[PDB]
Amino acid sequence: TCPFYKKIPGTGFTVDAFQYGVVEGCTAYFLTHFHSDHYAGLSKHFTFPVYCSEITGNLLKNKLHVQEQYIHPLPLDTECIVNGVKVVLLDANHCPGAVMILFYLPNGTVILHTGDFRADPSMERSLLADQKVHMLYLDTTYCSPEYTFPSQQEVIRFAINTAFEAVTLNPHALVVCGTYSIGKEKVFLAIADVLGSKVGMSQEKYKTLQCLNIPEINSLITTDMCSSLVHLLPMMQINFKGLQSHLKKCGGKYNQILAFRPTGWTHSNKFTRIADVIPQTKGNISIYGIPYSEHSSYLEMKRFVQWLKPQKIIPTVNVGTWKSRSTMEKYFREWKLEAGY
Ligand code: NI
C-alpha cells in the first residue's frame, strides 16, 4: 500500500505514487519528473488525472503513450487551482521538467514537496520566501557530510577544455558521452558546442531529446552518427571493450576515443579536486569519470533547510531501513539546534 510519505494530508492528492494500483481516496496523481523510479507503474493503461510540468507531459504522451485526456500540464511559477486547492510548481534544478510542488492547504498549512532536487541559493528568492512553510518532504539522497561535489559549472569547464585539447591534438578523435535517462544534457551539449558539432545519437534517444523544449534543438542534435564528432551511447557501453567495438562500427572515420562517464558521487570525492582528475587509458581509448550531480550535496541541502526553517521534515529517499531514518533524524536535530528554529 501507498506510503504516508507520498500522501498530502487533507487533500486527495498523491506524489510519485503510480506503482500501488488504485490509491483509495486519490483524486489527482502528481508526477515530479520523468525518472523510472518515480513514474514506475504508469503506462497507456492508466485512466486517472496526472498533474506535471509541460516537459514531463510531452514525455508521458510520446515515450510512455499515456493518453492525452489524462495529462494535465501546469506552467511554472504560477498559482493554479487543482480540485479546489491552490498549488505552485517550481523549478527543482534536477533533470528537464523536474518540479518541486508547493501546496496551500484549506486549513492554512503550507507544504513543500521537493521531488528530486539540487538545492540552490536562487531558491531562497522564489515564491517560497513569501510565507511560512510548515512541512517539508525532502530529497535526502546525499544527507551525510561525506557527500561533497564540485559545482556543475566547474565540471563543465573541465569537460570543455579536455575535449577541445584532445580533438585539436588529433582531429580524427571521437568524443563519447555515456547516458541512461534524462538529465545531465549540458555535459554533451557543451562539449559539442566547443567542437563546432552536433551530437549524434540513436532514434530512441533523439525522440527523448525532442520532447524537452530545448531552444534551437534541431541545430544541436542528429541521428546521422557519420556527420557528428560527439556521440551518445548507453552508460553500460562506456568501457574499453564497448568503446573499441563502437570504433569498429564507425567505418575508420575515427582512430581514437575520449569518453566521459557522468556519475553521482563515488568514494574518490574525499581527496581529489576537479583539476586533479586524470583518466583511465588502454591504447587509443581514454575514459574520464566526472562527478556531475543533479542532487543536493550535504552542504547545499543543510543551507536550504536552515533557511526554510520547517516545523517538520519528511524524508523521501533512503527511508527503507531504521538505521538510515535514525541517522537522518540526528542531522535534522543538529541543523535545528544550530539555527534556532
Ligand atoms: Ni530523479
CATH number at residue 65: 3.60.15.10
CATH of residue 255's domain is: 3.40.50.12650
How far is the C-alpha of 335 from the C-alpha of 69, rounded, in Å?
45
Residues 59, 162 share a domain? no
- Find the 317 Cα to ligand 1 centroid distance in Å: 11
Residues 275, 184 share a domain? yes
**Placement of cell 582528475 in the chain:** 277
Compute how many other C-beta atoms are within 10 angstroms of the C-beta atom of residue 46.
Answer: 16
Q: If residue 308 lies in a helix (H) or strand (E), which one and from where to where? A: helix 298-308
Residues 246, 199 share a domain? yes
C-alpha cell at 215: 531552444
Pairing of strands 230-234, 285-291: unpaired
How far is the C-alpha of 172 from the C-alpha of 151, rounded, in Å?
31
Residues 159, 32 share a domain? no
Compute how many other C-beta atoms are within 10 angstroms of the C-beta atom of residue 49.
Answer: 16
**Placement of cell 501546469 in the chain:** 74
Residues 264, 331 share a domain? no
CA distances (Å), origin 242, targets 6, 167, 170, 260, 262? 40, 21, 21, 13, 17
How far is the C-alpha of 167 from the C-alpha of 257, rounded, in Å?
10
Counts of helices then strands in the chain (DSSP H, E) = 8, 17
- Find the 92 Cα to ligand 1 centroid distance in Å: 10
- Find the 128 Cα to ligand 1 centroid distance in Å: 22
- Find the 35 Cα to ligand 1 centroid distance in Å: 5
CA distances (Å), origin 124, targets 24, 119, 227? 36, 10, 44
**Placement of cell 531552444 in the chain:** 215
Residues 172, 195 share a domain? yes
How far is the C-alpha of 341 from the C-alpha of 75, rounded, in Å?
33
The domain of 165 spans 148-295
Are 31 and 52 in contact, with CB atoms under 8 Å apart? yes
- Find the 139 Cα to ligand 1 centroid distance in Å: 9
C-alpha cell at 279: 583518466
In angstroms, this model's resolution equals 2.0
- Find the 287 Cα to ligand 1 centroid distance in Å: 25
Residue among 137, 136, 117 nearest 293 (CA): 117
How far is the C-alpha of 27 from the C-alpha of 13, rounded, in Å?
6
- Find the 256 Cα to ligand 1 centroid distance in Å: 33
Phi, psi (degrees; rounded to nearest 5) at 122: -60, -25
Are 30 and 73 in contact, with CB atoms under 8 Å apart? no
Residues 199, 304 share a domain? no
How far is the C-alpha of 219 from the C-alpha of 228, rounded, in Å?
12
Q: What residues are neighbours of ligand 1 (ion), with CB under 5 Å?
A: 35, 116
Residues 279, 173 share a domain? yes
- Find the 115 Cα to ligand 1 centroid distance in Å: 8
- Find the 174 Cα to ligand 1 centroid distance in Å: 29
CA distances (Å), origin 215, targets 118, 218, 224? 23, 8, 20
Cα–Cα–Cα angle for 100, 38, 327, rounded to 5 degrees: 75
Helix H, strand E, coil C: the string for the chain is CCCHHHECCCCCEEECCCCCCCCCCCCEEECCCCCHHHHCCCCCCCCCCEEECHHHHHHHHHHHCCCHHHEEECCCCCCEEECCEEEEEEECCCCCCCEEEEEECCCCCEEEECCCCCCCHHHHHCHHHHCCCCEEEECCCCCCCCCCCCCHHHHHHHHHHHHHHHHHHCCCEEEEEEECCCCCHHHHHHHHHHCCCCEECCHHHHHHHHCCCCCCHHHCEECCHHHCCEEEEEHHHCCHHHHHHHHHHCCCCCCEEEEEEEECCCHHHCCCCHHHCCCEEECCEEEEEEECCCCCCHHHHHHHHHHHCCCEEEECCCCCCHHHHHHHHHHHHHHHHHHCC
Number of domains in the chain: 2
Which amino acid does the sequence have at 301? M
Residues 77, 33 share a domain? yes
How far is the C-alpha of 160 from the C-alpha of 74, rounded, in Å?
35
Residues 237, 301 share a domain? no
Are 298 and 119 in contact, with CB atoms under 8 Å apart? no
- Find the 255 Cα to ligand 1 centroid distance in Å: 36
Residues 103, 32 share a domain? yes
C-alpha cell at 107: 486549513
How far is the C-alpha of 291 from the C-alpha of 148, rounded, in Å?
10
Residues 312, 227 share a domain? no
- Find the 292 Cα to ligand 1 centroid distance in Å: 14
**Placement of cell 546525499 in the chain:** 142
Compute how many other C-beta atoms are within 10 angstroms of the C-beta atom of residue 326.
Answer: 9
